[PDB]
Amino acid sequence: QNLGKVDRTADEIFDDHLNNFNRQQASANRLQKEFNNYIRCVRAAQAASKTLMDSVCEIYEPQWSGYDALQAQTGASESLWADFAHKLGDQVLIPLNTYTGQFPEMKKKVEKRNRKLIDYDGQRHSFQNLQANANKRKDDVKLTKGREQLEEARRTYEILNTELHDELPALYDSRILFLVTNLQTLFATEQVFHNETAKIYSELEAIVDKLATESQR
Amino acid sequence: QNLGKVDRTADEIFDDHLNNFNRQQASANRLQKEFNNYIRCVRAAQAASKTLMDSVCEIYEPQWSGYDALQAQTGASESLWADFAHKLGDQVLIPLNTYTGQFPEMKKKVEKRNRKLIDYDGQRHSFQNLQANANKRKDDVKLTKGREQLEEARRTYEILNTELHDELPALYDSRILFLVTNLQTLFATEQVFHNETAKIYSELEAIVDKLATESQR
């Protein structure tokens, strides 16, 4: 168990790059799914906190102490919930949708390499039993100058295979930097929202203590 | 505009108590509605934060720095979300459902007073034109000893009306103490959840900084 079985062929290396990419793509699609589920669950929570606070504000009467303070600290909350939801669906989400979207076009390129490969081997075979069955050394019919056509499938496959041998691992390595940056944004957005919202709720706690002390004596 | 129009009859005072009670009941039903909406919106948010964090934990690899720390700080979060949702549906909610539930049985009692009143006036009328049309002073038919029956409707109304004249304002005054106590629980539950969850997310922020610094040099 180690860091690259050193006896692999170039094709076996390519396959390993494929397993990694399939897995990278499955992991980003899942993150985008769950995060999109989180956002609307958040949005709906924002909405419910608002209609609930609108109630607390309604049933708490003007003439009681802390009333204007309550209106105020409630409005402060509406705004934190809105930064939070903006930052999630914009700053956090869009990079996720962008990183996630580069995978389908890469898969398309890989399926183009795999296709160009069975066409090229399909002409190596086809042209090797053209050399055998029909060729005399002295005459090349224009039929064995579909040799020019074989060099097309091989020039065309070569460039693609080579590009994928660099492009795939390159993309795989991008995974770390992508996540450190996305999660940094996500975790900071969460931190700020939760910590400011906390400051608000202890303000609200305090206000309600003063009404509890006054109305009790 | 003042604190009790001092020229009111006892009935006009009762009516004012009714307006206050109807309003107290409409405000508690609304609070219970919105708060129940908040709870399931919260519950669903808990669920979504969990499946999302399970993703972050999946896509973050064992071999990277901070990985076990991530698992850990994530589990810590699952539990805060669970205190929060327990405390909302139990400590905050049940007193709300209990305070809210005393209103329908009070309304039933008020509709019993109002009913007993139109029966009693309905016999004052009925028995005043029994005194008139048929009564000679010298003979009481056993028909004007449904006078005993009138004193039933008036004894029975008297006790109810009197009980409501004390019970209704008593309940109205309970409104302040109820809310200071319910909101104290609610706001503290919120405070603790948000402030602890904040501590978790800056831990998560820090972990991800260390992976960003290490993987970058």
Token couple for B200: 């978790």
Q: Find out whether B43 and B85 touch, Cβ atoms under 8 Å.
A: yes
Is B49 in Cβ contact with A37 (below 8 Å)?
no
Residue B142, CA distances (Å) to A144, A204, B207 in order: 134, 69, 95
Q: Is B211 exposed, middle or buried (0-12, 13-18, 19+ CB in 10 A)?
A: buried
Name residues whose C-beta falls within 8 Å of residue B144's C-beta, 6 or more positions apart in sequence. B127, B130, B131, B134, B135
Closest Cβ–Cβ partner in A37, A176, A212 for B180? A212
CA-closest candidate to residue A145, choices A125, A131, A159: A131
Is B60 in Cβ contact with A52 (below 8 Å)?
no
* CA neighbours closer than 13 Å in the CB half-sphere of residue A186: 23
**Measured between alpha carbons, how far is A147 from A123 in angstroms, rounded to an integer?**
9
**Measured between alpha carbons, how far is A147 from A153 in angstroms, rounded to an integer?**
10
Q: Which amino acid is at B126?
A: S
Alpha-carbon dihedral B10, B15, B19, B21, rounded to 10 degrees: 70
H-run or E-run covering B197: helix B147-214
Token couple for A137: 């050394």
Q: Is A44 exposed, middle or buried (0-12, 13-18, 19+ CB in 10 A)?
A: middle
**Measured between alpha carbons, how far is A134 from A161 in angstroms, rounded to an integer?**
32
CA-closest candidate to residue B196, choices A198, A42, A205: A198
**Measured between alpha carbons, how far is B179 from B31 in angstroms, rounded to an integer?**
11
* Helical ranges in chain A per DSSP H: 10-59, 67-87, 93-131, 147-214
Q: Which domains does chain B have, with CATH numbers?
A: 9-217 (1.20.1270.60)
Token couple for A95: 């990079």
Which residues of A, range 51-70, sit inside 8 Å of B by Cβ? 51-52, 54-56, 58-60, 64
Token couple for B196: 């602890």
> Is B188 at the interface with chain A, CB within 8 A?
yes
Rg (CA), chain A: 32
DSSP assigned state of B89: I
CA-closest candidate to residue A215, choices A67, A52, A75, A73: A67
In 3-state terms, what secondary structure has residue A136? strand
Place of tokens 């090349």: A140
**Measured between alpha carbons, how far is A202 from A69 in angstroms, rounded to an integer?**
12
Q: Which amino acid is at A133?
A: N
H-run or E-run covering A144: none
**Measured between alpha carbons, how far is B99 from A149 in angstroms, rounded to an integer?**
87
Interface test with A, best of B41, B84, B204 (most A CBs within 10 A): B41
Is B59 in Cβ contact with A215 (below 8 Å)?
no
Rg (CA), chain B: 32
CA-closest candidate to residue B50, choices B69, B74, B72: B74
Place of tokens 């219970």: B32
Q: Find out whether A168 and A21 touch, Cβ atoms under 8 Å.
A: yes
Q: Which amino acid is at B39?
A: I
Place of tokens 């309304």: B107
Long-range Cβ contacts of A120-125 (<8 Å, 24+ apart): A120/A150, A120/A153, A120/A154, A120/A156, A120/A157, A123/A149, A123/A150, A123/A153, A124/A150
Name residues whose C-beta falls within 8 Å of residue B48's C-beta, 6 or more positions apart in sequence. A34, A37, A38, A41, A42
Is B52 in Cβ contact with A35 (below 8 Å)?
yes
Q: Find out whether B208 and A183 touch, Cβ atoms under 8 Å.
A: yes
Give the chain B residue whose CA is nearest to the CA of A27.
Answer: B59
Taking the CA of residue B9 and the nearest CA in chain A, the distance in Å comes to 27
Taking the CA of residue A46 and the nearest CA in chain B, the distance in Å comes to 9
Taking the CA of residue A7 and the nearest CA in chain B, the distance in Å comes to 24
**Measured between alpha carbons, how far is B79 from A160 in angstroms, rounded to an integer?**
50
Q: Find out whether B212 and A184 touch, Cβ atoms under 8 Å.
A: yes
Place of tokens 């972050």: B56
Phi, psi of B216 (to 5 degrees): -95, -35
Q: Find out whether A100 and A126 touch, Cβ atoms under 8 Å.
A: no
Residues of B in contact with A35 (CB under 8 A): 52, 55
Interface test with A, best of B53, B190, B207 (most A CBs within 10 A): B190
Residues of B in contact with A203 (CB under 8 A): none
Beta bridge partner(s), residue A139: A136
**Measured between alpha carbons, how far is A215 from A99 in angstroms, rounded to an integer?**
57
H-run or E-run covering A5: none
Taking the CA of residue B37 and the nearest CA in chain A, the distance in Å comes to 6
Write the DSSP assignment of A187-201 as a string of letters. HHHHHHHHHHHHHHH
**Measured between alpha carbons, how far is B51 from B57 in angstroms, rounded to an integer?**
10
Q: Find out whether A104 and A58 touch, Cβ atoms under 8 Å.
A: no
Residues of A in contact with B54 (CB under 8 A): 34
Q: Which amino acid is at A160?
A: L
Q: Is B103 exposed, middle or buried (0-12, 13-18, 19+ CB in 10 A)?
A: middle
> Is B34 at the interface with chain A, CB within 8 A?
yes
Residue positions counted in chain A = 217
**Measured between alpha carbons, how far is A110 from A189 in angstroms, rounded to an integer?**
37
Interface test with B, best of A23, A30, A38 (most B CBs within 10 A): A38
